[PDB]
Amino acid sequence: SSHHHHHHGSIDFSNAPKRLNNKYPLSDQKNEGGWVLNKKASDEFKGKKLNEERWFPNNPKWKGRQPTFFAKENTTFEDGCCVMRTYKPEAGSLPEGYTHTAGFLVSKELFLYGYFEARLRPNDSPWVFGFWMSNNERNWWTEIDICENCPGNPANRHDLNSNVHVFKAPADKGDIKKHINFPAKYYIPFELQKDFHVWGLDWSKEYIRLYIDGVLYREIENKYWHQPLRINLNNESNKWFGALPDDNNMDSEYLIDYVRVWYKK
Numbered sequence: 721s722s723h724h725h726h727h728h729g730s731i732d733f734s735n736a737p738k739r740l741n742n743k744y745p746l747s748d749q750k751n752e753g754g755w756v757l758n759k760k761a762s763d764e765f766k767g768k769k770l771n772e773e774r775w776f777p778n779n780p781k782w783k784g785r786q787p788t789f790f791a792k793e794n795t796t797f798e799d800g801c802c803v804m805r806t807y808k809p810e811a812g813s814l815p816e817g818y819t820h821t822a823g824f825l826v827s828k829e830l831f832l833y834g835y836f837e838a839r840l841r842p843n844d845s846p847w848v849f850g851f852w853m854s855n856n857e858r859n860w861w862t863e864i865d866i867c868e869n870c871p872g873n874p875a876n877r878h879d880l881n882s883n884v885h886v887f888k889a890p891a892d893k894g895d896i897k898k899h900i901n902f903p904a905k906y907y908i909p910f911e912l913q914k915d916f917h918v919w920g921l922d923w924s925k926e927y928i929r930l931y932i933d934g935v936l937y938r939e940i941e942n943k944y945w946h947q948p949l950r951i952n953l954n955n956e957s958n959k960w961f962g963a964l965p966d967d968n969n970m971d972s973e974y975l976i977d978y979v980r981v982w983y984k985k
């Protein structure tokens with residue numbers, strides 16, 4: 721697989737949609753899609769505390785990819801953002817194989833189709849930042865990686881990654897016995913970590929459509945992704961991105977301004 725090197729194309733932002741309102745998707749500000757805001761699941765992240773009726777404060781099903789262990793204390797709320805930090809606790813404090821901590825939130829709600837959007841300021845540190853959706857339930861396990869990137873590794877500053885996975889699917893839902901995925905990366909003309917950007921997903925029975933700052937950059941025929949999914953926000957380690965801890969570069973912040981969810985009227 722060539723996706724460590726291959727930019728399929730570049731993404732042009734000269735005609736990118738202007739922000740007109742905070743009521744509809746950035747890629748559809750005039751609401752041609754007939755969207756309705758999901759007020760249960762959407763979060764503007766105001767205040768100083770997690771809404772723990774809406775979110776789990778860590779990941780109950782995954783401790784983390786070594787060497788980074790998900791912890792509740794790494795996620796705080798400041799100036800209208802969820803803020804995720806990375807720490808190195810004292811030696812011996814974490815379970816075997818783990819040396820650093822990162823934050824993780826999982827939605828208590830499950831979703832099937834709709835528009836999903838998050839405004840994100842990446843951490844400038846060698847941890848992947850993630851806004852993605854997944855579910856592992858009754859031997860059906862699928863995942864949509866709206867945003868899985870690590871510009872905090874300077875070699876990756878101009879990459880925009882995307883992927884979708886089927887880890888397993890029963891006979892009547894795709895019949896997948898071996899993990900399959902479909903990664904694709906694109907060139908972006910700015911360094912991803914410098915500013916907030918808006919990731920969008922228009923997920924329908926027919927297509928997965930992915931948007932960056934309102935610009936469509938990938939379309940996927942929706943063959944397999946018909947399973948309800950939870951929303952995940954987190955930092956993690958991943959050797960593939962060169963996303964391994966750096967004790968001299970771990971003081972950055974992953975900022976989530978909002979998560980917005982819409983359904984069809």
Ligand SMILES: [Ca+2]
Pocket residue numbers: 764765766800801976977978
């Ligand atoms: Ca906010």
